[PDB]
Amino acid sequence: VPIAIIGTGIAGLSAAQALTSAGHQVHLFDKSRGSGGRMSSKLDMGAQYFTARDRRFATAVKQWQAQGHVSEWTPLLYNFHGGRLSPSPDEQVRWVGEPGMSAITRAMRGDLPVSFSCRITDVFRGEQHWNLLDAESENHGPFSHVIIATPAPQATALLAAAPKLASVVAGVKMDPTWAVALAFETPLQTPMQGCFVQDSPLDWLARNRSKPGRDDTLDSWVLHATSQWSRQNLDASREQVIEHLHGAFAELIDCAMPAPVFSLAHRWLYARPAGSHEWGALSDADLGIYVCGDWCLSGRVEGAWLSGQEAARRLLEHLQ
């Protein structure tokens, strides 16, 4: 009887990889149409790049490199500060999924059993097995154990079987982020490939074609608003967000900007944890339910991967 994993972002799939390497069967669930979560699903509108500071995660990254799914990104970086643009070089090693940030999670998932477009609404156990109800009122199960791998505010609904755990998870605040993508037929006449931005609706922007293995046909840029701006405009329409963030971009850019060939906006209500944690994972081993996600640790790709490893590690130890 398989282990259910709810959420197919990096935390869920990291857990899935660990369980499957150990010879155990899983079944993955995601309310979305594909996997990846906040890494985006297979223009990189979500996570833009990641660092590896933890040796275990660094080892995982070298594995992905050897598989052809990540490469190093070394953009010409800028800072926008007090209304002026300046180069901001550094020696930070940064990684991207290749050919897109989505390739990492797509590879982790591989051919594992998965139910997409399946929003889980309830998680409950009988005397032996776990069961999931989805938004269509269809039952799924039996399952031997359950791993919740969602943003904290979306996990709370799935933890009704362990109210003390639910209560802890419910306290975890996540900030929203609006993202906008713009694509141009004629490349913008600048050497800038990325910018850290202050005193603006924006805090980050990136040039996709500067990333290894991307399609160079259009010059596409990703704009990420600050969480403060995002909150202030949380219920804005996509078109309004595009207009404001496109404007913020035109304001700071040092060159002409033609009309884009297309423009996109995407809102994450639960983009990132407001703070850091050291839990790693949360679990109720007695009941058989485990919780992981970036918000159990540092709120970065590395934190998500590590959190899912820890949940799996605990599950496997209790399978005994």
Ligand X SMILES: Cc1cc2nc3c(=O)[nH]c(=O)nc-3n(C[C@H](O)[C@H](O)[C@H](O)COP(=O)(O)OP(=O)(O)OC[C@H]3O[C@@H](n4cnc5c(N)ncnc54)[C@H](O)[C@@H]3O)c2cc1C
Ligand Y SMILES: NC(=O)C1=CN([C@@H]2O[C@H](COP(=O)(O)OP(=O)(O)OC[C@H]3O[C@@H](n4cnc5c(N)ncnc54)[C@H](O)[C@@H]3O)[C@@H](O)[C@H]2O)C=CC1
User: Does 164 participate in binding a copy of itself (rule CB under 8 A)?
Assistant: yes
Torsion of CA 187, 189, 193, 199, to 10 degrees: -120
Distance from C-alpha of 147 to C-alpha of 28, rounded to nearest angstrom: 10
Per CB under 8 A, the segment of 13-21, 43-51, 158-166, 219-227 that binds a copy of itself is 158-166
For residues 206 and 221, the answer to whether their CB atoms sit within 8 Å is: yes
The interface partner of residue 30, options being ligand X, a copy of itself, ligand Y, none and the CB cut-off 5 to 8 Å by kind, is: ligand X
User: Does 217 participate in binding ligand Y (rule CB under 6 A)?
Assistant: no
Integer CA distances (angstroms), 163 to 154, 167, 170, 192, 294, in order? 14, 6, 10, 49, 21
Based on CB atoms, which residue is closest to ligand Y, 3 or 179?
A: 179
Per CB under 6 A, the segment of 85-93, 112-120, 137-145, 282-290 that binds ligand Y is 85-93
User: Does 177 participate in binding ligand Y (rule CB under 6 A)?
Assistant: yes
Minimum Å distance from CB 193 to ligand Y? 12
Distance from C-alpha of 123 to C-alpha of 272, rounded to nearest angstrom: 24
* Phi, psi angles (nearest 5°) of residue 298: -95, -10
Distance from C-alpha of 66 to C-alpha of 55, rounded to nearest angstrom: 17
Question: Which residues in 106-261 belong to E strands, given as ranges?
Answer: 114-115, 120-125, 130-134, 139-143, 146-148, 174-184, 194-197, 202-207, 219-225
Distance from C-alpha of 5 to C-alpha of 12, rounded to nearest angstrom: 6
Of residues 29-48, those binding ligand X (CB under 6 A): 29-32, 37-39, 46-48
User: Does 45 participate in binding a copy of itself (rule CB under 8 A)?
Assistant: no
Where along the sequence are the contacts to ligand Y (CB under 6 A)? 50-51, 77, 79, 88, 90, 92, 177, 196, 203-204, 224, 226-227, 271-272, 299-300
Where along the sequence are the contacts to ligand X (CB under 6 A)? 6-12, 29-32, 37-39, 46-50, 119-120, 149-151, 154, 177, 179, 224, 268, 271-272, 293-294, 299-301, 304
Annotated binding-site ranges for substrate: 49-53, 88-90, 177, 300
